């Protein structure tokens, strides 16, 4: 008596343009066992993307829906790379007959400013431990270090490979048939008069080529026709009431770490150090919550906010509440730090994690100002009080910042050593600010298992018991 | 009883300071057969203009009203070139004794930036098919191309000519007496000591000089005087109750393509593919709607958005509903595209149409940033992925856009040749970007007849049957 | 009830609307004059930003009429700006702080001149003008003022300053050169006191007594007595003091304000709208009740077309048999004189700034500024007259049309003034050429009928008709 | 149970008067005093993580309440991950300070930092005019030097040296360790941290800056042992300062009026977060005329401002004194220049040893841009009845007008040192030897007669009551 129409608009996120990963996944799953829904339509024309892990996860639920025997259809005029990824999960893909399958690969590109700085006479002070902690490089050079390019080439090549393999599996062709490279996609388009849909069909990226309204045909064939709507029977994700789970009364707390780790209360699309700790603390203190899932998708951020979060989490574990980390997309640097006290860590193969390293920057403009004839002066009871963007950074402060940074790396490899049943010398080998795919992190001991949020929740329940429901924060 | 006061303020647009072309026409027409209305008075002081075809279509309703032997008067301190066109349609034109009828001709003005972009070190990539697709020119030249100036002179000459011929006819004086050229007008104004008013009266642009108050007297003699309003007997267009036509059970549905063609939905004062497609779809499916008139005033836009709109309109035709295009100011590039599936296209001779061609522009600033000491680095899994505003556009990427354009052309000239009972080689001979007046377009087979909305509507009712009303979208 | 009227004017004085009604202050003072419960005036000008000299003199007239009835008028302040003191000087008695200043320093005009900047930016500047004294144009075309412009500006400014000094000298009853002795004298006089400005003021009679804000509070309570309720000497502020609503006769004189620069549309900002004002003029034209019109002008000018629009209605009212009297206050120059043309009678303050019979237009273009950064314009036209844009060179054809337009406007202007003033275009020319005139010169050369103020306009307006009036102010 | 800790989870800055984030110095001190005698408050916990500082005199005043609190046998605990310098000052008054196992107590000293731009103005062709009396009236140097003068350096060194030394001696006393172990200078700190491998918490704990190292969860276990557990609130039994009903005092009908001069002194009515001559004057005025008001305390925290606003206020205060109501000034933070001027008329001036005051001196600055304009080809012209009227930013400042300002500065300087000399039983010639714009700590002020005694608000209120009579309450003119 309907299709579920996944006309997703905007983007996939962990916690709200913005769509909840879990709501999609849960909605699909509900639809699977819903007698009123007979199949799924993907309309991805206002879908800007998501991270690879999260889109894999929707890939999974889509596949479960397929296996119960209700069909899943993919229909657009064109497909963006991000869009095609999600659409490769359908039984049948329709693309328009002049439309495109836009596959190009991944690129990582960042701006560097040493020259501008020097030109502007800025004084730049870098404090760091990590050969591969490369977010610092924009201040100190014109380009990437060989080190940085090794680390990046590795994870880029890997995520892209995963893309290709996941799409290959899904379309039952070999990977370089999905994307043979620029030289081949170009030859292949040449044997096709530059027909992009025609290449897309002879190489099996796509199933049939069809107008919007002769698609409207095949769709009313399948799911029927409504006259109340004058369009094939169906209902949008945005409309379909995702039913509210039964209260067991005995739950698993789900805490989010979405975005960058800042110091205050939560503002923006950022992790507020103090907010998260409060949520974790609420979990620990509530006798109904029996285990915690820290769901992490964070580039990293403030060290001290990281430690505030970690220490609440440790507390929960020490109070005999098990802690399991679901990394989705990124759990890096401070994102790993916060993950460190977990009983178990699980990552997607395409998750970016690691980047166990540390850094601070300090810029001052004393020469900048000098050159246009501005100057500072004052009286200080200590050089340590003369630390402001308009004053040279004093040596005394330089030396203890270095020292503080060093201590920080130590604290970091030490937490990881203790948490991962390892030694500091061993952690140092897989640290140095090096970023790792989920897969690399599993190989080197940083993460316990490859999987997704389902695996995280299952393991949480395992470490206690029974018949659970989820308290989201 | 009273006068109709056409105190138009703002602009004339197809569909909403803004005033509905159609509401004006039909109000005049209603007032023609209203015993209560005894003449029209046009006061165009706050009116900033409309395009030539629209104001001509207002002219038409004025002539009809006039022909019922009710009088039409234009009063004012001065007339701008736009204001004067419209008033020239009146039986009698009052000009203030030191006022001016400001005829100066038509021009076209654009900025060109090749040298600026070169100085700023901007890399500019132009992808095109069409010698006469000139809007791309500001990025790659300092003046206009030979080509451009021929296409642009053709239509501009024609339109101005159409202006003069309309005004001459309306004033019963030769076109060269309405506008003698810069030199003649100097001569004529010299003979007058710079009394532009006396020039207007002696060359018959105008029928009487008089102040606001003397004008009052003569309009109150003509329409009587309202003890109650303390002014001559008259109602304002804005307060005049335009009857809402009766509901027969047979409709011609009017859909408006007004503005630039965008991918989203109805935005700003643009056209949204999806909204317009949906309107067309509503009409196509509603059994009351017997034919469709796509009203078009569009410079063009997004190819894909054009296609979403074409398909629907072609769907409607296939389903038995006659489709008629009313071109009303502009219908060019995407404006033509969306018109293509029509059974019948009618244009004003003054419409601007055609411009069958295609272009994309990319600018990258890699050298721009380089000279200020700012640089970019990354890793990519394919040169195809490495495409953004701060990086050099990879050859591989260039080749792919070239093709995508060389091939949207093919798409374009194929549509036109199918809809106009012609061939690809033939259409090329008159496409290649070149914009055409409605009259050149009729002459080369792009447009079926020269007329206006009336004529459009007429053809629609004829290609079905009977006793219509209009449904608007 | 029983106490001072407290003139704690905060802000500017203006014809219309921080903003205060000229007419409201005067009429209020006037009512305080015959109000038995008001026994005096106290002026507290500390938050007073100023008014045009004619206005403050008008206010002064009303303060004198008040003094003359036997009620005292006192001025109090820590200091007096030049503006404040002018009004303060009309008091019986002026109290100043023991360390305060009377800040008298003269009048000055000052403007920016850009010729070189425009040259350096490669801007093209096109000035069309008839009037050797029409100086608004000079910024675009000199790096300084012209000798001519300087003569006109010197005459009027030297004159208004003289008038300031004579009013105040008379108000204080000491010679003008004692009111302000020039800078050398001021410096010398002030050195003698060791730089005490308050003692300079007391000794040179600009001020009557020295006092702190509390001893002043003592002196005023000893005069108006004390209000156990308001915890102050008995008074009521201008802002709280209730203005009796004039009764209506049934025979009004309409009052219309042309206050500000003259623009084309509806009234906006604090500016005149051609159409708005004319509508009001037309409105009184057709109210049977309204028997004459005073046009109250305070305007540097504006759009020529909008001036005409106001002038034509004004003329129409007159042809309708209503007399029209212009009342100039501060300025009524250029457009603002033009709108005065059709009156049976024009009255100015001696310090009014009027005249400026002249005309101009200015066109800047940037084709060379843009050529230098590598921008250009190009296109097609059915006639050079259609290529007139900020970004394009001004075409010779348009250039000629403009020169003819401005000459034609000048002849328009000097011709309306000829017919209105009983003179000839060649006579008017001799006293036009864009020259600004004090009300005083406007009087000697014919542009104005008499020297006076709003009272005189209104009285004349009633004189050309009948008996007993009241005002309809078209503060619409 | 229903007994708990007071939580001084202060957020923002401490100010004399909150100005519609800002907490009232007086509400804080008064709540702690109430809490002291409240059987329902069993201790205090300072959580000072979102506390942004307050001036030294004001924060000491809070310390004194804190101490009275402690001296009645209730504990006072300070907790946090870190301590900024301003936070540690207050933290230090606690019986016991917790810090996170890797946190920092961030001590670094006091510094003054200003911009000097004589070279910019010369580049930009600007014309600077400086009119002054006072060698140490230094706020004028940025326009004319590219660095501070030796005079300015001597003066600012004397006072910043002094206030820091006070920071140290207070915090030292509070902790019971020598002053040079609260902060052994930068070398000392570097040496300490080298020993410690860069561990800021070990350094703090070993040198006794702090008592325990703990995470928040641990600190909580501790505070709930000490105050009990609210099963109700799910936390250690406590109430936040922001929720504690500060009782309003029983009304007498014999009152001491409190007037706040808080901020820079401007000529209008009260604007911004500034003092307006007229509003303060008027509040002084009500107090003069209320028979209920028996004395006035002027609470001053001001670097100064407008000469003529200052005088307006001074005059009203004089009036109050002379009408028979004593005037006592409590300076807290600054009361300098105009801040001193307005204080002059008082019976008694009390100041914190760390108050900044003095700065008897005077200055005006005129900058003109006629040559800046001239060089982008912009110019000014006009006509004038006298060069005195020819004074704006785009014109050269005429010699005549210069002579007049120079004369005006010289005069207002005499007015100043005379005001002071009459007020403080001295002479102009004597006051000159300690004016010349020289700013002075409350302590140096005492030494030279500008101030009657070192102390705080309590000491001003007391002195005011003592200048008339009896039992009393305060009217605070606020809003």
UniProtKB/Swiss-Prot annotation, chains A, B:
Effect noted on mutating residue 448 to N: Increased activity
Resulting phenotype, residue 290 to A: Reduced activity
Ranges of the Periplasmic topological domain: 1-473
GO BP annotations, alphabetical order: signal peptide processing
Regulation of its function: Inhibited by serine hydrolase inhibitor FP-biotin and by antipain.
GO MF term (any one): serine-type peptidase activity
Active site residues of this protein: 133 (proton donor/acceptor), 333 (nucleophile)
Localization terms from the record: Cell inner membrane
Enzyme nomenclature, EC number: 3.4.21.-
Knockout-associated phenotype: No effect on processing of liberated signal peptides in vivo.
Membrane topology according to the record: Single-pass membrane protein
GO cellular component: membrane; plasma membrane
Top-level division of the source organism's lineage: Bacteria
Effect listed in the UniProt record for changing residue 176 to H: In strain: ECOR 16
Keywords, in A-Z order: Cell inner membrane, Cell membrane, Hydrolase, Membrane, Protease, Serine protease, Transmembrane, Transmembrane helix
Subunit structure and binding partners: Homotetramer.
Protein function: Digests cleaved signal peptides in vitro, its in vivo function is unknown. This activity is necessary to maintain proper secretion of mature proteins across the membrane.
Protein family per UniProt: Belongs to the peptidase S49 family.
Domain notes per entry: A tandem duplication in the protein fold creates an intact active site between the repeated domains of each monomer.
Protein name, entry field: Protease 4
Name of the gene this protein is made from: sppA
Full-sequence portion shown in this chain: 56 to 549 of 618
Curated annotation (Swiss-Prot), chain D:
Phenotype for residue 114 to S: In strain: ECOR 16
Entry EC no(s): 3.4.21.-
Result for mutant: residue 180 to Q: In strain: ECOR 38, ECOR 39, ECOR 40, ECOR 50, ECOR 65 and ECOR 68
Effect annotated for changing residue 180 to H: In strain: ECOR 16
Impact upon substituting residue 137 to A: Loss of activity
Catalytic-site annotation from UniProt: 137, 337
Cellular component annotations (GO), alphabetically ordered: membrane; plasma membrane
Comment block on domains: A tandem duplication in the protein fold creates an intact active site between the repeated domains of each monomer.
Function: Digests cleaved signal peptides in vitro, its in vivo function is unknown. This activity is necessary to maintain proper secretion of mature proteins across the membrane.
Identification of the protein by name: Protease 4
Organism this protein belongs to: Escherichia coli (strain K12)
Gene name of the encoded protein: sppA
Portion of the full sequence shown: 54 to 551 of 618
């Amino acid at each position: 008596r309907g299709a579920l129409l996944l006309d997703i608009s905007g983007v996939i996120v962990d916690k709200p343009q913005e769509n909840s990963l879990f709501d999609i996944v849960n909605t699909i799953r509900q639809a699977k066992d819903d007698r009123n829904i007979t199949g799924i339509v993907m309309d991805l024309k206002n879908f800007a993307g998501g991270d690879q892990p999260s889109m894999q996860y929707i890939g999974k639920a889509l596949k479960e829906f397929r296996d119960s025997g209700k069909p899943v259809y993919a229909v657009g005029e064109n497909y963006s790379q991000g869009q095609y990824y999600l659409a490769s999960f359908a039984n049948k893909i329709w693309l328009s007959p002049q439309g495109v399958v836009d596959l190009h690969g991944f690129a990582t590109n960042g701006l560097y400013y040493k020259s501008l700085l020097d030109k502007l006479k800025v004084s730049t002070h870098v404090f760091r431990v990590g050969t591969y902690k490369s977010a610092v490089e924009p201040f100190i050079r014109d380009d990437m270090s060989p080190a940085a390019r090794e680390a990046d080439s590795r994870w880029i090549g890997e995520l892209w490979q995963n893309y290709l393999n996941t799409v290959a599996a899904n379309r039952q062709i070999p990977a370089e048939q999905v994307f043979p490279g620029a030289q081949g996609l170009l030859e292949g388009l040449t044997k096709t008069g530059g027909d992009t849909a025609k290449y897309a069909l002879e190489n099996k990226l796509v199933d049939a080529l069809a107008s919007s309204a002769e698609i409207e045909k095949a769709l009313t064939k399948e799911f029927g026709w409504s006259k109340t709507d004058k369009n094939y029977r169906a209902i949008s994700y945005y409309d379909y009431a995702l039913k509210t789970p039964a209260d067991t009364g005995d739950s698993i707390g789900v805490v989010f770490a979405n975005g960058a780790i800042m110091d205050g209360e939560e503002t923006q699309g950022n992790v507020g150090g103090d907010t998260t700790a409060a949520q974790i603390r609420d979990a620990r203190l509530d006798p109904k919550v029996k285990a915690i899932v820290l769901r992490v998708n964070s580039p990293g951020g403030s060290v001290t906010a990281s430690e505030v979060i970690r220490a609440e989490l440790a507390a929960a574990r020490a109070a005999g509440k098990p802690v399991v980390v679901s990394m989705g997309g990124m759990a890096a640097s401070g994102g790993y730090w916060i993950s460190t006290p977990a009983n178990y860590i699980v990552a997607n193969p395409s998750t970016l994690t690691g980047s166990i390293g540390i850094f601070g920057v300090i810029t001052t403009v004393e020469n900048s100002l000098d050159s246009i004839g501005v100057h500072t002066d004052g009286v200080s009871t200590s050089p340590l009080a003369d630390v402001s963007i308009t004053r040279a950074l004093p040596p005394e402060a330089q030396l203890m910042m270095q020292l503080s940074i060093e201590n920080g790396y130590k604290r970091f490899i030490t937490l990881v050593a203790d948490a991962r049943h390892s030694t500091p010398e061993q952690i140092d080998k897989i640290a140095q600010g090096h970023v790792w795919t989920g897969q690399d992190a599993k190989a080197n001991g940083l993460v316990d298992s490859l999987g997704d949020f389902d695996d995280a929740v299952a393991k949480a329940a395992e470490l206690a018991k029974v018949k659970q429901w989820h308290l989201e924060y």
